[PDB]
Amino acid sequence: ARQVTIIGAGLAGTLVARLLARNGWQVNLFERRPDPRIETGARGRSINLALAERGAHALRLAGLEREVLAEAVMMRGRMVHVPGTPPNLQPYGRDDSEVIWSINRDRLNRILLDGAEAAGASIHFNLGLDSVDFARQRLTLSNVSGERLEKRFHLLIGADGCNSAVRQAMASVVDLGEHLETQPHGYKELQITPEASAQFNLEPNALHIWPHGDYMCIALPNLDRSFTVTLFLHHQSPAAQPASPSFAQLVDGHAARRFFQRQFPDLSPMLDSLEQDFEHHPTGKLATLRLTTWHVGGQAVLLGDAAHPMVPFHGQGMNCALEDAVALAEHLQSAADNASALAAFTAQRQPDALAIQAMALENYVEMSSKVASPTYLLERELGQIMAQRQPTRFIPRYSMVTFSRLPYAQAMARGQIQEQLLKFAVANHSDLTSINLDAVEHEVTRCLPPL
Numbered sequence: 001a002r003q004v005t006i007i008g009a010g011l012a013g014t015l016v017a018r019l020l021a022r023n024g025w026q027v028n029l030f031e032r033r034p035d036p037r038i039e040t041g042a043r044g045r046s047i048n049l050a051l052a053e054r055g056a057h058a059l060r061l062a063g064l065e066r067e068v069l070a071e072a073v074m075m076r077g078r079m080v081h082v083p084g085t086p087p088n089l090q091p092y093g094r095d096d097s098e099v100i101w102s103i104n105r106d107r108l109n110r111i112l113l114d115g116a117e118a119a120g121a122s123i124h125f126n127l128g129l130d131s132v133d134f135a136r137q138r139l140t141l142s143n144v145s146g147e148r149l150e151k152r153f154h155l156l157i158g159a160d161g162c163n164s165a166v167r168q169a170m171a172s173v174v175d176l177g178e179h180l181e182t183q184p185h186g187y188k189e190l191q192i193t194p195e196a197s198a199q200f201n202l203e204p205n206a207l208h209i210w211p212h213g214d215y216m217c218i219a220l221p222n223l224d225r226s227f228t229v230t231l232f233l234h235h236q237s238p239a240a241q242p243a244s245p246s247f248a249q250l251v252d253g254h255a256a257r258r259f260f261q262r263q264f265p266d267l268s269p270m271l272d273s274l275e276q277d278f279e280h281h282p283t284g285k286l287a288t289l290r291l292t293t294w295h296v297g298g299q300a301v302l303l304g305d306a307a308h309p310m311v312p313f314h315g316q317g318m319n320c321a322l323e324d325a326v327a328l329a330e331h332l333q334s335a336a337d338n339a340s341a342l343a344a345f346t347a348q349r350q351p352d353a354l355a356i357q358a359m360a361l362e363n364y365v366e367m368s369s370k371v372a373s374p375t376y377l378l379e380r381e382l383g384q385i386m387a388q389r390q391p392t393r394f395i396p397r398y399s400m401v402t403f404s405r406l407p408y409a410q411a412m413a414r415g416q417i418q419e420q421l422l423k424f425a426v427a428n429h430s431d432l433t434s435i436n437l438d439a440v441e442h443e444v445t446r447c448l449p450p451l
């Protein structure tokens with residue numbers, strides 16, 4: 001039986017543990033945090049994640065989809081809150097079977113942890129990876145008190161998140177070619193209670209967006225009708241725009257309150273604990289980290305956030321991580337040897353990871369900026385018309401990323417063709433009546449092969 005050691009009992013690490021263990025691998029999984037299934041008196045605070053078809057299919061392959069969806073809120077569309085107009089529901093995809101699921105991250109982790117153990121994996125909590133000796137095939141783990149433990153390993157899977165200790169160890173023996181692209185936006189997570197969401201008739205079965213240009217809020221529903229709200233806002237005000245909102249100008253909750261009353265007037269009444277949450281929850285940081293290589297020979301490999309930290313603006317980090325896990329398990333299971341498996345996995349997934357990294361960054365202006373420009377609405381109106389005329393050729397990029405399993409690289413490649421096509425077609429035209437619909441449809445057939 002082939003052996004594997006996995007660092008990080010997160011989403012990708014527990015899914016790949018289950019997939020390999022049920023295939024007969026001997027799987028040991030080490031996690032720095034305690035087991036969240038051991039109930040304590042602490043008040044856990046979990047965010048929700050948007051689970052899309054990519055992630056759902058990965059869970060489906062693992063035999064865990066029904067259990068996860070049993071605990072997920074169905075989001076049938078986007079509820080767009082734009083000042084001046086009532087909230088507008090934009091249904092997802094083209095049919096009523098295309099939805100996104102709001103799943104509590106802790107609920108999901110417990111389902112995955114149970115699933116990995118049922119398949120035969122052994123999970124060891126309260127043990128953080130400190131170092132790896134690749135030449136001697138040994139690694140060093142320690143608890144929170146620093147007591148150290150050495151283990152031999154045969155195959156090392158770094159599924160240990162955006163601050164991967166496995167990545168750090170690999171960069172000591174191989175040039176990973178790291179390029180860190182810092183993001184000027186931070187985020188703050190806020191909360192709407194079930195009482196508040198009911199009192200203001202906030203729709204539970206939808207994903208809510210408050211676009212506002214350089215900043216925005218979004219909210220995802222929980223089973224108990226609470227919502228977790230995320231504010232995206234610049235860390236610092238630029239010198240060019242010294243009065244522009246930023247976290248540095250919100251020194252306390254009272255400043256935050258006045259800011260929300262002015263810029264999010266229909267949302268502020270629902271944020272009962274805005275002041276307390278703002279000061280007691282830390283401001284998160286966002287970054288994109290691109291690596292040229294994800295593996296060291298056949299000894300170690302990265303996946304998930306360990307391999308490709310990305311901005312959350314597309315709701316695809318978890319979905320990509322689960323897709324990564326399926327691909328890595330497939331390659332390891334059928335390859336001639338671990339070295340071939342890790343090279344083939346990297347060669348398959350690295351261009352797709354770059355794609356979703358770039359599309360997630362681009363999708364920020366799509367949510368907050370590109371909703372009030374006249375050209376955008378005519379392009380989307382023309383994009384929907386082309387999606388009906390050529391449904392196997394023109395699929396909007398959001399639907400390809402979210403509701404299909406087409407490789408991220410093809411989704412971005414086809415999306416660029418589609419975006420330029422719509423851009424040229426609507427240029428110097430103000431109405432759909434002044435646009436020739438068969439000329440755009442002919443370009444769809446010339447430049448977009450059917451799927």
Ligand SMILES: Cc1cc2nc3c(=O)[nH]c(=O)nc-3n(C[C@H](O)[C@H](O)[C@H](O)COP(=O)(O)OP(=O)(O)OC[C@H]3O[C@@H](n4cnc5c(N)ncnc54)[C@H](O)[C@@H]3O)c2cc1C
Pocket residue numbers: 007008009010011012013030031032033048049050051127128129130159160161162163164165166187230303304305306312314315316317318319320321
């Ligand atoms: C604010 C925010 C919102 C997001 N929203 C979405 C969304 O709506 N949809 C979506 O698809 N994605 C979303 N994402 C992205 C998603 O959360 C991550 O991409 C996903 O969790 C990656 O899974 P992973 O298993 O690679 O890493 P993680 O889930 O972070 O797991 C890493 C694990 O490794 C452990 N670990 C770390 N270091 C060590 C060590 N040295 N030794 C041992 N164990 C270690 C950690 O404790 C953790 O258990 C969001 C991210 C953020 C920050």
Ligand SMILES: O=C(Cc1nn[nH]n1)c1ccc(-c2ccccc2)cc1
Pocket residue numbers: 050078100209218230312313314315363366367
């Ligand atoms: O589903 C999406 C993509 C989308 N783009 N336009 N409308 N939504 C989506 C985008 C972002 C998130 C998210 C990010 C950080 C924190 C909390 C949630 C969730 C989900």
Ligand SMILES: [Cl-]
Pocket residue numbers: 310311312313314315316317318
């Ligand atoms: Cl993400």
